[PDB]
Amino acid sequence: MVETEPVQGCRDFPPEAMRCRRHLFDVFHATAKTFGFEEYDAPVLESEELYIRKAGEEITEQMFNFITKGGHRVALRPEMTPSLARLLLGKGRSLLLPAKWYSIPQCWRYERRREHYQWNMDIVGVKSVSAEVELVCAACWAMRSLGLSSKDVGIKVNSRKVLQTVVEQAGVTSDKFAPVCVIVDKMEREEVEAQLAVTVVDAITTTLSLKSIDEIAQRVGEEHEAVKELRQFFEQVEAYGYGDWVLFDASVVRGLAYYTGIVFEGFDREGKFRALCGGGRYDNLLTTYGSPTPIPCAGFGFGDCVIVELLQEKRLLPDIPHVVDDVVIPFDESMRPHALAVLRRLRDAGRSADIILDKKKVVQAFNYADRVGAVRAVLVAPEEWERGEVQVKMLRGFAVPLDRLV
Amino acid sequence: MVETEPVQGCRDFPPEAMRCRRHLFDVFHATAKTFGFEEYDAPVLESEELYIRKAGEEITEQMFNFITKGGHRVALRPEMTPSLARLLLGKGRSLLLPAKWYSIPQCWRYERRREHYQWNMDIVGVKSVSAEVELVCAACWAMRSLGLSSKDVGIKVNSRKVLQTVVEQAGVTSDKFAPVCVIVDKMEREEVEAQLAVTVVDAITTTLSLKSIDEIAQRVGEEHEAVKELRQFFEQVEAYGYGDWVLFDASVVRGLAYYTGIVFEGFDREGKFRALCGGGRYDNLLTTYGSPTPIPCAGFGFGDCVIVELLQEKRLLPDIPHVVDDVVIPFDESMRPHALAVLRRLRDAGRSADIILDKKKVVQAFNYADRVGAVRAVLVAPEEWERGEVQVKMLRGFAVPLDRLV
Ligand SMILES: N[C@@H](Cc1c[nH]c[nH+]1)C(=O)O
Ligand SMILES: N[C@@H](Cc1c[nH]c[nH+]1)C(=O)O
Ligand SMILES: Nc1cnc2ccccc2c1
Ligand SMILES: Nc1cnc2ccccc2c1
Structure with missing residues (x-):
């Protein structure tokens, strides 16, 4: 040690x-x-x-x-x-x-x-x-x-x-x-x-x-x-x-x-x-x-x-919790490429955003989002992705077109 | 040395x-x-x-x-x-x-x-x-x-x-x-x-x-x-x-x-x-x-x-010149108290502002304003002060009421 x-x-x-x-x-x-x-x-x-x-x-x-x-x-x-x-x-x-x-x-x-x-x-x-x-x-x-x-x-x-x-x-x-x-x-x-x-x-x-x-x-x-x-x-x-x-x-x-x-x-x-x-x-x-x-x-x-x-x-000097606008959540690993494209759009527009980096279940991803002080969680799931959409949920699950996230 | x-x-x-x-x-x-x-x-x-x-x-x-x-x-x-x-x-x-x-x-x-x-x-x-x-x-x-x-x-x-x-x-x-x-x-x-x-x-x-x-x-x-x-x-x-x-x-x-x-x-x-x-x-x-x-x-x-x-x-890496929103100019030393009150209002409203600290003529004050990259010069003069006003001039001399500077 x-x-x-x-x-x-x-x-x-x-x-x-x-x-x-x-x-x-x-x-x-x-x-x-x-x-x-x-x-x-x-x-x-x-x-x-x-x-x-x-x-x-x-x-x-x-x-x-x-x-x-x-x-x-x-x-x-x-x-x-x-x-x-x-x-x-x-x-x-x-x-x-x-x-x-x-x-x-x-x-x-x-x-x-x-x-x-x-x-x-x-x-x-x-x-x-x-x-x-x-x-x-x-x-x-x-x-x-x-x-x-x-x-x-x-x-x-x-x-x-x-x-x-x-x-x-x-x-x-x-x-x-x-x-x-x-x-x-x-x-x-x-x-x-x-x-x-x-x-x-x-x-x-x-x-x-x-x-x-x-x-x-x-x-x-x-x-x-x-x-x-x-x-x-x-x-x-x-x-x-x-x-x-x-x-x-x-x-x-x-x-x-x-x-x-x-x-x-x-x-x-x-x-x-x-x-x-x-x-x-x-x-x-x-x-x-x-x-x-x-x-x-x-x-x-x-x-x-x-x-x-x-x-x-x-x-x-109240404790100041960390914050971040969005946390992007791949429904699973196969959605990672698409989740990355979405992370790109959010950051491009001046927002602070994470993407879940490790492999984990959605509920755990959501918990993680809440721990790091995310204002919003963006779930990128197969069925929504086909409609040109993601699922958005405010923390401070309606579907949203990609253009309207920013 | x-x-x-x-x-x-x-x-x-x-x-x-x-x-x-x-x-x-x-x-x-x-x-x-x-x-x-x-x-x-x-x-x-x-x-x-x-x-x-x-x-x-x-x-x-x-x-x-x-x-x-x-x-x-x-x-x-x-x-x-x-x-x-x-x-x-x-x-x-x-x-x-x-x-x-x-x-x-x-x-x-x-x-x-x-x-x-x-x-x-x-x-x-x-x-x-x-x-x-x-x-x-x-x-x-x-x-x-x-x-x-x-x-x-x-x-x-x-x-x-x-x-x-x-x-x-x-x-x-x-x-x-x-x-x-x-x-x-x-x-x-x-x-x-x-x-x-x-x-x-x-x-x-x-x-x-x-x-x-x-x-x-x-x-x-x-x-x-x-x-x-x-x-x-x-x-x-x-x-x-x-x-x-x-x-x-x-x-x-x-x-x-x-x-x-x-x-x-x-x-x-x-x-x-x-x-x-x-x-x-x-x-x-x-x-x-x-x-x-x-x-x-x-x-x-x-x-x-x-x-x-x-x-x-x-x-x-173009040279980046220093800037500041306002430079406040006492017409003379007798206007300093009033110039200070005005400096206070400008800063109170989120603006960056200097006041001419030394004793000098208006034209020199204006030159100084231009050297330090001021967007605006605010002259505080006796005759305008009685009308509840200052003189404002943009650098990037109309009279203005105090309330309307911000
Ligand atoms: N410490 C490395 C850079 C580094 C940061 N984290 C991992 N590597 C360097 O000085 O080159
Ligand atoms: N150097 C002084 C503070 C100071 C800055 N400028 C003039 N005085 C100190 O350490 O206490
Ligand atoms: N020169 C000085 C003065 N005060 C200090 C106080 C705390 C820690 C370091 C210092 C160094
Ligand atoms: N540890 C290092 C590495 N690179 C440097 C380069 C320039 C100056 C200081 C340095 C220190």
Whole structure:
């Protein structure tokens, strides 16, 4: 007996499970098309240098890396964004901007699950908060398409620029800002104070606990960069009709080094699950990768696990049975040639159809039709075939001419 | 500057290239649904033991394998069939048969390209040639859906049972049959005679060169296992309406150890390309993996490269431009809130729509609309907004009430 279980921390998707995944992905695709994003993809295997950021990020700590026989340092991607940037930087001046790109890559880690699929959506070449508005709306749109409401979930929103100001105004060099976000992201675990030592810590704490935009306007003015952007953001989301889905939370920073402005997280309103999705603006990434001109970017990742737990809890993942329009049933083996001709007509006309492949009695064929979720069974029998007909029976036995089956 | 090229032997899919891939995959999916197959998937990372067959197969020679930090021998799958069998064997008695499963996995090698996507289609629990008929028809159906005809391509068909008889009748132990197929598959390169030594070689040669089923009927009878099956196969394909797509070729064995019966290959009728797809029956695989009951199986793999070359040569891959139904254009920033409300209505009604995200003049917005392949541009201007209207202009400027846009 061979080992039937999959490799450690990896999922099998037999047809039952695959229908569930495909239900989720159909939404990701449909939302992307509704929002005018273009699909792209890149190798799951990337060069390890792509992810060496040196900021203590959990995503790079837990990187599934290995050495080829030719001695190259490579890894199964922990995230997609660096791949996106490589492609963008590769295209250079030939890329029309603004660009809106999406994908649903499988991403990896070594530490629990070692893989997940992650919908990625990114807008490139847009400086204004209109990008983040669109992105946050897309995420809400996908969750609403899955049957969730603003009673079920929300998106917490913030700007890193606020904290940046404090880091700056507290005489704390620009260089160290990314380390601080990464540490402060760990707040939800108790001894984050210890990491920041390795005062300006206090001002960070107070600013995370500020419960409103007015309170941040009071801390650094109604026309700070962050205040105007957040107001603009909330206004646009309100106008698009998703006001009840979004809110301000000063504690949201995200764990990734490269976020420079607005950042956001989806969450369940019952407090039962980790972040449903996550993202932000990252206007400097392409500059760090060597771009001669700064390229504004923003985007998000939306995993395939947390969302499924949430949907299961809310009872929004009813089992989806397989279906097929027709099952064609030879009365016996001598009718197979004729049954095949009929299968051809049905498929020719855009229908999904099986033919009983094995030899079996009609009643067993009918049972089989019902097991595979057939809408209709088409019996091809000698006496009917002479009249130019088949027998049709709906499952969700009148005789029918061949021309009228479609 | 970061390395913009992808890892060795791996392809990037920016949006242009992705539309081409998606055009191909839409066919693979659509054909699978037309033929009633159910989608499945499994980890690209499998345990290396899955592929140790010890028959000199090129697919296992060139296996992209490596050792985890925990010391496990794993590999990026060179093919899908073993993964399929693992899943099937895992399900055991709970799996309803017959089962028809498909997927489009990315598969790997280390040696040229190191990755490709491969449509897999497999029928499980069907002893009769009706399985192989369906499979071969599915492959033809996909190629016809891509615009090819029986003048462009065909499927060569054969049974390994013929050669098995010769191997047996030539006092050559059953054990060594798989090695022989793998060697004889190399015939198309000159010194295959040398490998078979490492006589019965002559009888193998003659039987590969037999140009018809009657000639094989003359060599071992009109009621050999292989003769009846091949006749049944050609009859069923004829009846389904794909007679001009298929033909007999005694030289076709395929390179994989596990094929036991009918085997087949798609090919271009100009002799310019390698095999388009390939498959056969493999009734013993699950028995070798430890199944207590023999499970008949048959299937095929259909790669994503050769087919694309062929389609390019035949001029059947016209560039596919991106499209989107509407682009919404704020007359200026003060109209953004109103433009957003309109974007909402359009998307609500099932349309794909952008809104100009950046700040720009109307003429530039219109140009942008044309670049991204918009069918329609929707200008939201102050004077029209007061009349409850927008300006609409078709690209493939009459005023319109909001209700009538959808
Ligand atoms: N790469 C981020 C998500 C993201 C996409 N684009 C920008 N951010 C993550 O893995 O959490
Ligand atoms: N695994 C085979 C194709 C196949 C699928 N099912 C049976 N055979 C190949 O890679 O060539
Ligand atoms: N880079 C990451 C992040 N989160 C994950 C969650 C589950 C499985 C794999 C993952 C890989
Ligand atoms: N196992 C295989 C077989 N053929 C391939 C062709 C191209 C790239 C990768 C491949 C992997």
